[PDB]
Design a protein around this ligand. Sequence first.
Ligand code: MG
Ligand code: MG
Ligand code: MG
Ligand code: MG
Lengths: 390, 196, 94, 217, 107, 609, 252
Amino acid sequence: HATYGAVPLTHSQVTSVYATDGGKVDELGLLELVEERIFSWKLNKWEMRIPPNLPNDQKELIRQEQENLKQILSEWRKCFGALNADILQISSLTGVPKDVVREKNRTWLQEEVAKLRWMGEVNKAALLRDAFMRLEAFGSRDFMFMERLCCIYGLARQGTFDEAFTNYITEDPVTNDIFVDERNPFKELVAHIVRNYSQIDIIYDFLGFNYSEGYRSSLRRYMEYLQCKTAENVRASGRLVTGDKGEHNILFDYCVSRESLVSGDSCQGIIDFLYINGNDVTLIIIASDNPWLRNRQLPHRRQMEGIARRVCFVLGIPPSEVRIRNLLLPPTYLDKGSIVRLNDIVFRLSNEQSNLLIPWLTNYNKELDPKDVDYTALAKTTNEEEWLTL
Amino acid sequence: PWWNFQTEHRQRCVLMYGGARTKNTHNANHRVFIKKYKRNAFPNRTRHHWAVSMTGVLSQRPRRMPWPYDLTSLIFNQPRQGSDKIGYVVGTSMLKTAVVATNHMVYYPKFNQRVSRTKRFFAHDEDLACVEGDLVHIKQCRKISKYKHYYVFSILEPNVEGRERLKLGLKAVPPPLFGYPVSRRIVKLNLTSTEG
Amino acid sequence: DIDAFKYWFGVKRCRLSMKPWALLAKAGLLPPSLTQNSKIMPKPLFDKESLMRYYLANRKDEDVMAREKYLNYENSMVKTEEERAAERPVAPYL
Amino acid sequence: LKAGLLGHYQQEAFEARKRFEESTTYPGPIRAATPGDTRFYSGSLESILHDTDRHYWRAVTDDPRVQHLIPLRIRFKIFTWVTSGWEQRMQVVQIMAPKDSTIAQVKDLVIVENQSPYLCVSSFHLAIDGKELDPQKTLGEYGITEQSQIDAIEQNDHLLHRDDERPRDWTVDEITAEDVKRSPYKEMEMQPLQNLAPRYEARPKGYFGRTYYSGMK
Amino acid sequence: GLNGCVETGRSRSEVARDLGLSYTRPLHENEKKQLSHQAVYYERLAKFKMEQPEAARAMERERFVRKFSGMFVKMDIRSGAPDFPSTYRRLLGTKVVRWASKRHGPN
Amino acid sequence: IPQEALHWLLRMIVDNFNPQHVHYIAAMKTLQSAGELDMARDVWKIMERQQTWPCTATICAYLDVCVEAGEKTWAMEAWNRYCTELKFLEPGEVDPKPISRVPFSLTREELLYLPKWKKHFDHDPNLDVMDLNRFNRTREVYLRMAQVMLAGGERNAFQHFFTKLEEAMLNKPTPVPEPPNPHLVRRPRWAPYEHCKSVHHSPWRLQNNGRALALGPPVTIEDEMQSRFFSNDQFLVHSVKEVLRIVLQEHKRAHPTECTRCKTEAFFYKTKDADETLKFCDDLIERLFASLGVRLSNLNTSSLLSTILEVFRVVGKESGAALLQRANEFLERKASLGDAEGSRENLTASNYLQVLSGFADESAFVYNTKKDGTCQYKTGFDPRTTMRHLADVVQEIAGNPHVTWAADMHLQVVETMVGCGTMKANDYFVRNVLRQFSWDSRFLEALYVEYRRQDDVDMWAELTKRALVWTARYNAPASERLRRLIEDDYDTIRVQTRTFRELAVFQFRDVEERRHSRDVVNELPNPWYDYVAHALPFPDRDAGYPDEYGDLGQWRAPGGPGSPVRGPGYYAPPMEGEHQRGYTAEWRDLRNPMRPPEFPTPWERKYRQ
Amino acid sequence: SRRFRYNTKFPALVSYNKLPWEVVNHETPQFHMHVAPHYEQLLTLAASSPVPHIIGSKHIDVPREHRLRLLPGMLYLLDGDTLPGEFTINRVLDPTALQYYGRLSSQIVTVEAVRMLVPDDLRLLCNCITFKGPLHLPVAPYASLASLRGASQSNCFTLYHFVRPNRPPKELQLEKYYIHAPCVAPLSEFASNSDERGNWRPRLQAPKRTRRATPLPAYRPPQSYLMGLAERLAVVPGGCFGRRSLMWGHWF
RNA sequence: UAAAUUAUGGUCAAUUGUUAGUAUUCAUAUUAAUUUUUUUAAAUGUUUUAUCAUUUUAUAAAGGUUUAUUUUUGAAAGAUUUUUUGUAUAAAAUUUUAGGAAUAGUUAAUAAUAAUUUAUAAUUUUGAUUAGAUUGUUUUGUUAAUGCUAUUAGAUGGGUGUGGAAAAAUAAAAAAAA
Ligand SMILES: [Mg+2]
Ligand SMILES: [Mg+2]
Ligand SMILES: [Mg+2]
Ligand SMILES: [Mg+2]
């Protein structure tokens, strides 16, 4: 639980703590076991998990993050229970063993529904059809594998849950004897995650789990990783990363728009990142939670023209072939569509080679929040415009 | 049938005392007033009695009743009525004592309106922190003196002007030039020389 | 009232008059009152030797009497072995 | 005060709190101070017999009440009558002496906590390995721990007058129970109380009988 | 130190005392005299009692005699009422003439 | 009755209070002291259903209940719920955890912008768990878990827990004990009235006084600190003693007929599990001795010696002389391990009580052996040898001035003398126990066996009557067993032990009960006589009232005290916020014909139709 | 204010010392009535257990300044009837006062003299009880009284008890000596160091009975007027001891 | 200043007597009450005791109270005992007069029970104090009515300091120790 020594950890501290010499385990089975242990908990086990000796704002941020983790884990528990109930119902209705239902297909479903309808069980046939149709969506073992790994990574990062998965008094199902198993699967799974997924923190921040410092640092790390993988001669100096001449590959961390923007003032145009690739300039701006500040945040056409002219002046790129454009990113997360657009526009990478470079990209399936329609409309009308020339 | 609260009250009356007071009190009885003093020489300096007077506290027409629904009920969850109050400090003349004027609501069913009446309380401040003009929250407590049973729980809004005047050496609030009359007769000024 | 009567009679231990006692004797809550006596038979006469002889003839077991008075005075909702076994957890203890 | 402005005042208070949190933030955690006692309690005045300087409920244990103690043992040379004659034996008395206590304080604790008219009847002094301990020195200077064997050497001619008036249950809270000869550490339980009697509510509130109706709350 | 503790009921003065703060408005000369003359009067009384034994003894004996002979020494409801003239205002005039007014404070 | 503690806890919950951990601990301890293990489990269930996370003290109390009940599943569930996080103290950490939660308070802005349910503070026990678990009493939790596993027979789990506890106690620093809390009982200062009766107020007997005791104690009590005040090595010794005590309790539970003094011949001889039990206990003792080197010489082991003697007296059928020899060997081994010369310790009151109990067990017998005479003793019993051993050990105890005698020790001596048939137990009782002790009826229970052996029935009767007069005088009411023993010889002695009133009541009650049982017409249940229907202050279903609105011609609304009317029925002056919300939508409205006043969520969706 | 600091419940009360009826005067026999049972209990304890500082070589010597402060409560025994100086002697010849020492004289040790010593300032009384003859009770070799020549066994030993003149009886009350030690006289027969071990025979079975108890003489009801039902009158079974509910031996 | 878009290719109504509840007679009142030809019935000796004594027997004196008066408690209940057993009193709102003004054994603080002191004190025109009237908090009458008009909740400093608690010297339907 919460202790005086307990403190939140960073990614480096997590890697330092959860370490394994070697070996390969069944990550899917380990994840299922850990999630079953989490679901076995009562609501009281989430109470004393915030370290006391911290400032109030930091404690509030930690509380919000832990509440988000609890909500997501409860939603996944409900989804898992519904999946298991559907599988059990299909098995009972059809007579097949409980393991082959996942491998059965639509033709088998048609045959079984026809058999039930012929036997006169129209109600059971309809229930079977509905159960199979809704089971096709959530029947995969790794339905939300990435998000579940991010949840477990966040639990590890909290630093108050690593000891909550051991010292359990358990009965051996074979010999019917009581013992206390000291094997902790949570540590093994977190060690496997940190050993295999090198960008697990980046995925965690992109999914929106990071409530303290947003995701801008992870975005910068992702962008500089792509830039170095492309250039192969990338040189970094503080908040500016530049390639070795040739084709222009420049990443500039101008400032953080959240602190740069000041309410009640009039100043239009504050960019977060500036990316120069070839003769193109892209202004990557992270939106704010305040809908009245986005209009200030987006720079004007005159500002874009002036920035392009300054790029021509400094880098010597001829004014004839110079394009500039904006790129608005969601405020608290980074969805799959936004990431794909970022890869396509900024780094000029097609989907196939982007997935070749990044394994976790194809399984990243985060979508935009349906509630925020102001941001969605602004992002559409900002990303559907053509490049500003000269 | 749904029985009104009058039925329950009558039930309680019948339980406590055998039966209920249903005797048809003769409300039509002719009440009379026989004068005993002169036409204008009634023995009182404030009010003069010349007819039958109303009796009772809650039987006065027009009716006045308490109105619990006000700012205090909107803000605080009172364990008992009038346990917590909010007011302004209106005097610190007494040592370790702060006088607070609070507001409550009186309801007039005949006119269907409510009014804010003012009451003064002797709140207690130990360390002498209250300054006149402070918006304070006060709570009931034990008996402290002959008329002190409230204490300043918290100071919501300190009077910066009063504190700065005290630091400068002046009174927290300058005394009003008007006030109470010493008599019915008009108090005339005396701008006369010693000879006159 | 039955619940209130039992509360005042057992917990608070209130007194009792004779007319209410007779009425409750009719109601079956209480046995017939002390004053509900007929003239058909006079009061019994007690003899110590006869009483002792009857007690010796019919003396109950110590444990049996203790259990009877425990059930009458202390809790009468005593769980059996089956109830205790059903209460005991058998599932994986979490 | 006018109640129509409550919503506006709530909005302004929310804005002020948000500005405070955004700008001032929180410059590090502050150590929690143990709360004191409040003079202002509700109800009628209480008698001076029950004034224990605590008029609120607090389940936790405050820092001032916490004390650091060491389980010391003091051994006395006693004599028992075996079938032949008198034989030497050792009698050990257990005390809880604070870490910052002097030898004189340890001796006083032994005298208080002997609870037997055979050990501390006469005057005595504490020593270790024959070397007498300075009564003006503390346990830290001597390095005394629970393993340290402290012997007591008595003088028969001098008798130890009972000059102890401090109660053995005395502490900072000053909540001392008189006529209690059990040490504060020896007995610790929620023992049932037989002097009083349980009391049930006899005066009803609102409902008296017949139909409940509203209940008159 | 401007807020009371709702859990324990402590006032803002108690909270400031526990936190070691100080919320005392600039005192005027009369207030300073009020806070300062208590010790002076106590020292004067102690000095008088230690310097004039017979006079102090006579005064204390007379005070105790009048206290013991007072008609209302018993602490019943009437003696325990905080405001006798206001609460038992029916007695004023007809029976008791000590108080000419039934109201002295804001109650 | 013991049920009242649970009743008061339930009443506390019903009256809208949050039962604190001290309340739960007191309820469980009272129910355990009354033997209501099921009711203690019910108290724990109540605590869980209140969504209260127990503190470590509550955990320890519940585990004490579990080990007393012998049920391991309850303790295992409790461990899996609220005990998988408890850890021992490490040398590089602060011993007393500082207070974390600042007391609840509201600032100026919060008092206005927060809702009333956020601004409300009732003493929720879940907010104080962190500051109640700041003293780290986890070693007691581990000891309780080891005890419950030993009781349940899970040897591997018990070994795991005991090894963890031992490795903690031998290598980790002692936690700071929690100080006693004097704010739990409202006890008046001093004594308001100084009147106090003398110890010789009654000219017929000496009696105790509230100031000082003069009748001597009836039970031997070990003078030792609490577990929280014990040191790590001292707590290890205490844990060994507690494990042995649990072993003895389980043995008694398994063989109840083999432990009572005078029931049958099965008591005299060993059971079939005695060798294994003694081997386990001796192995544990040797493990403790090996683990603790010369440090053991500075630890109070009187409790350990007493429990070892009790185990080797009950589980193993050893003699009093053997028990005394074992205690002396234990003390001399302790002295030799401590390398002391001529400074051994003495047996304490509890150790001597165990030795005397062993002698009484040797001298025990079966009363009449269900044959109306010829009481059966143990095969191979030597009254001369046993009585000589008892005499010399009693003389040794008396010569030792630091052992304070008690009623239980004197009862053991009297029982041994009766069993040996010395015809002097009556003299010993009348000289040592009668005048200066608060003896109970067990003394006369045994002294009746000796009285039966008098040559003349007249002497037997006179002794019995004098014993009864002693009970009447020294406030030691005759026990039911003693009265029945005297009753069984009524044909010979013609001595009465039942009062005229009791016999008169009993005859009528027995005749009526027999007649009622034989009668079949009145065997039907009577609802008026069998149960109480409803005992809560409020009805269990909504009958419609209250109205919370006025009606035509009712000017007084709200009614204030004792009136549920909250506002005028039809029109009111303007209201603000929640008052307006309640007056327009939320308040009850009986006269509404479409729907009754709705139930709170979620009890409204299920009665939609 | 000062009036509302506390309520008037449980006011400060005058101590029993000032009240005359509360305190006990030494001249009255009640003083000896209070102190005799303590003396006999102390002697019984000392005849079976070694009390550390109950027997001294000579009277306790303290400076006259501290004499009044320290002496009250002191109690010790000496050999011979030597009395401390600066003490006016008053022998107790009153039978009403002497009757309370009857049990002590008969059962413990024959009481020879009772004296009260009043100091010069009349603020520190001494009670001297001189006993003649050996102890009636058996004396253990380890007992404190074994040291005295005239106790274990001229043949006179004195007990001195210092108190204050006018005090409530609790000041006289002595409870530190109410320690109960067993008497091993009935058990000395079977001890190993006693040559009577092979004499007694264990009677392990009750003898067979051929006759019942002798019938009591025929009950004769009383003749004089009785006061009434003692059980209803809350009188103990004989006005002496017992319980009212368990009535016995009262005219019936 | 959007300009008359065109298979008009579905018309055939309503009522079946069923309901979300203050409804108004300008008065002569099938409204209430007092008033005319004279309405009756129950009483007064509590008991017990250890005998010139002790034990058990507690608000209807009615007065003239509008910032007012509110309280069972150490007795009893009551249980095989502490060791008395045992937190009763205090607050908020509502408070009369045709010809309206000052009030006072006073307010707070206090190392001060039983105030030799300190203060720029307290009450009040938002209606005080004195004087008059009147037993305070849905109970009566009447009306379409949040209007008007009634009402013994029978309540308190010098008579004994007893008693757990004064209310203790008319009564008031009451069972008080077999
Ligand atoms: Mg008047
Ligand atoms: Mg009022
Ligand atoms: Mg009583
Ligand atoms: Mg007025």
